[PDB]
Paper text:
Glycoside 3-oxidases (G3Oxs) are recently identified bacterial flavo-oxidases from the glucose-methanol-coline (GMC) superfamily that catalyze the oxidation of C-glycosides with the concomitant reduction of O2 to H2O2. Here, we report that PsG3Ox oxidizes at 50,000-fold higher specificity (kcat/Km) the glucose moiety of mangiferin to 3-keto-mangiferin than free D-glucose to 2-keto-glucose. Analysis of PsG3Ox X-ray crystal structures and PsG3Ox in complex with glucose and mangiferin, combined with mutagenesis and molecular dynamics simulations, reveal distinctive features in the topology surrounding the active site that favor catalytically competent conformational states suitable for recognition, stabilization, and oxidation of the glucose moiety of mangiferin. The overall structure of PsG3Ox is composed of a flavin- and a substrate-binding domain, comparable to other POx structures.
The structures of complexes PsG3Ox-Glc and PsG3Ox-Mang are similar to the native structure with r.m.s.d. values of 0.40 Å and 0.42 Å. but display significantly (almost twofold) higher FAD cavity volumes. Furthermore, these structures show higher a.d.p.s values and lack visible electron density maps of residues close to the insertion-1 and substrate loop regions. In PsG3Ox-Glc and PsG3Ox-Mang structures, the substrate loop adopts a semi-open and open conformation, respectively. The d-Glc and Mang were refined with substoichiometric occupancies (∼0.8) to have similar atomic displacement parameters (a.d.p.s) with neighboring atoms, 57–63 Å2 vs. 56–70 Å2 and 85–117 Å2 vs. 67–95 Å2, respectively. The weak electron density in the aglycone moiety of Mang suggests that this region is more flexible, presenting higher a.d.p.s values than the glucose moiety, 108–117 Å2 vs. 85–96 Å2. The lower number of interactions established between the aglycone and the enzyme could have contributed to the higher flexibility of this region. In the PsG3Ox-Mang crystal complex (and dockings), more hydrogen bonds were observed, which may explain the higher affinity and catalytic efficiency of PsG3Ox for this substrate compared with d-Glc. Notably, in both experimental and computational dockings, a clear preference for the positioning of Mang oriented towards the C3 oxidation was observed in contrast to the C2 positioning of d-Glc. In contrast, an open conformation is mandatory for the binding of Mang.
Author numbering: 5 to 73, 91 to 200, 207 to 308, 325 to 350, 360 to 509
């Protein structure tokens, strides 16, 4: 089923792995690419957002088919065990998506820009890569210029936030990846990847091990889930863009076990709240700051949550990074895919509860600016509800034992092996990470595309 050897073997089919296929299909057109996705194809084109399916029954079929083989939202599935431990909080609602397109087939396409300490300091071309990620995701800030209540909510929030703030951190329209239709991985891959005769997407293909020959990346061990047969595809470069959890799992199962692998895991603590407008008859952005480490997004709700005039407020906190926030794998216990079972060690420090308390007070302050608060008390979601897990394969300047990959997202111990996703982000971020993670993927894919085009082999 699979080719015996390719140039680049891509694990996963989310937006970050698709960004590797995108830049390689743009900058390295002669390189043969093999993308292996454990989940099935649930949309047309492969990786499109499920909302492109107008039929709710067909759309529910696409969502439920992505939930793998305390409830998870449509298109995602939770862990069955190893999500909490005595003495720690863990992530009881740590969810995952197994389908072509990954979570980008079910996400809401909010692509804000990092600011302050969120921005990775040792990347001088960060803004350059962030604009490129805007190009691949189709990000636009003017998707709701004709909305009646978008401008009203935005100006009423600005009356309490924009005080003393520079324009980059004032209330502004949330940059959205819209293609009406939310942009999925089909947008990231685009015509350049689908029309690339050297690229091929293999769905229902589980990658069980990363092959290493003489220290460098050798290939991937791919199990054909249609038949159960395990193949071995050779590759000069291996990109693992599974997710924030299964990416360190695949490396752990491959014997690639650095000290920082999975450690420094950080979830974005999320607070929700609702409020009502005041007039009779889009998504707003409350940017992060260092002194207010919260990321706010306000948007219209179809109806009131409690028994477009009603808005839903969501604040996301930046985590106090801890090394003991490790992702642990057990070789003896296997999950439903035959890979090592996950042990999630997550505990909010006192600094976390201090910031979380401030987020509840600030979202109430924001709810009073929009109008009459529909709710009475802001609700804190369980850890892992934001689906924004970082640091598990984080980048660093050196291999001091605190990072897993280079600034080019290249794993230190395994040359030719690259990791993609939110886990690559090493900083304490609060905004939606997918845009930044795609920007890091463009730098890593350009590191491969330049090494291929410049090589003599
Ligand atoms: C309801 C919802 C709303 C969201 N809204 C937002 C938002 O507004 N903003 C934002 O920034 N983010 C949002 N997200 C999160 C966003 O979708 C993800 O952060 C994004 O998909 C990350 O990209 P990725 O490719 O690294 O991860 P993924 O898309 O999860 O990539 C992992 C892929 O690899 C596959 N895979 C895993 N293991 C293997 C293996 N062993 N072999 C082969 N393939 C494998 C998986 O099946 C999956 O397709 C939302 C998520 C959900 C569920
Ligand atoms: O699922 C939907 C959704 C489904 C519909 O049918 C529809 O019409 C509109 C919808 O809008 C949404 C808007 C959202 O903000 C969220 C999100 O909460 C998550 C954790 O809980 C965070 O990851 C995301 O950062 C945050 O963006 C959503 O999950 C959804």
């Amino acid at each position: 089923r699979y080719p015996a050897a390719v140039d680049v073997a891509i694990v996963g089919s989310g937006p970050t792995a698709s960004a590797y296929a995108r830049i390689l299909s743009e900058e390295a057109p002669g390189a043969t690419i093999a993308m292996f996705e454990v989940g099935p194809t649930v949309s047309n084109p492969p990786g499109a957002h499920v909302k492109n399916i107008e039929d709710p029954d067909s759309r529910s079929l696409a969502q439920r088919a992505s939930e793998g083989p305390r409830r998870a939202r449509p298109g995602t599935y939770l862990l069955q065990d190893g999500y909490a431990f005595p003495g720690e909080d863990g992530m009881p609602v740590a969810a995952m998506s197994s389908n072509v397109g990954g979570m980008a087939a079910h996400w809401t396409a909010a692509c804000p820009r990092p600011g302050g300490k969120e921005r990775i300091p040792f990347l001088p071309d960060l803004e350059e890569l962030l604009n490129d990620a805007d190009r691949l995701l189709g990000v636009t800030t003017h998707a709701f210029d004709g909305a009646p209540f978008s401008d009203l909510v935005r100006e009423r929030l600005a009356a309490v936030v924009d005080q003393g703030r520079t324009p980059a951190f004032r209330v502004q329209p949330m940059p959205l990846a819209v293609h009406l239709v939310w942009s999925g991985s089909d947008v990231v891959m685009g015509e350049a990847t689908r029309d690339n005769p050297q690229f091929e997407l293999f769905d229902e293909s589980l990658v069980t091990r990363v092959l290493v020959e003489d220290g460098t990346a050798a290939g991937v061990e791919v199990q054909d889930r249609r038949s159960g047969d395990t193949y071995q595809v050779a590759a000069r470069y291996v990109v693992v863009g599974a997710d924030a959890l299964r990416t360190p799992q695949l490396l752990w199962a491959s014997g690639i076990r650095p000290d920082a692998l999975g450690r420094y895991l950080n979830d974005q603590a999320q607070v929700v709240f609702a409020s009502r407008l005041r007039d009779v008859q889009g998504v707003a952005w409350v940017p992060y700051t260092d002194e207010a480490p919260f990321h706010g997004q306000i948007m219209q709700l179809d109806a009131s949550p409690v028994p477009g005039s009603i808005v839903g407020l969501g604040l996301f906190c930046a985590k106090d990074l801890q090394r003991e926030d490790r992702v642990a794998f057990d070789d003896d216990t296997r999950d439903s895919y035959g890979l090592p079972a996950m042990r999630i060690h997550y505990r909010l420090t006192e600094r976390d509860h201090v910031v979380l308390d401030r987020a509840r007070q600030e979202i109430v302050r924001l709810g009073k600016a929009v109008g009459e608060p529909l709710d009475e008390r802001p609700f804190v979601l369980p850890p892992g509800a934001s689906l924004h897990y970082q640091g598990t394969t984080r980048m660093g300047e050196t291999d001091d034992g605190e990072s897993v990959c280079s600034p080019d997202s290249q794993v230190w111990q395994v040359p030719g092996l690259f990791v993609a996703g939110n886990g690559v982000i090493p900083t304490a971020t609060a905004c939606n990470p997918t845009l930044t993670s795609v920007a890091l993927a463009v730098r890593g894919a350009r590191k491969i595309a330049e090494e291929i085009t410049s090589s003599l082999l």
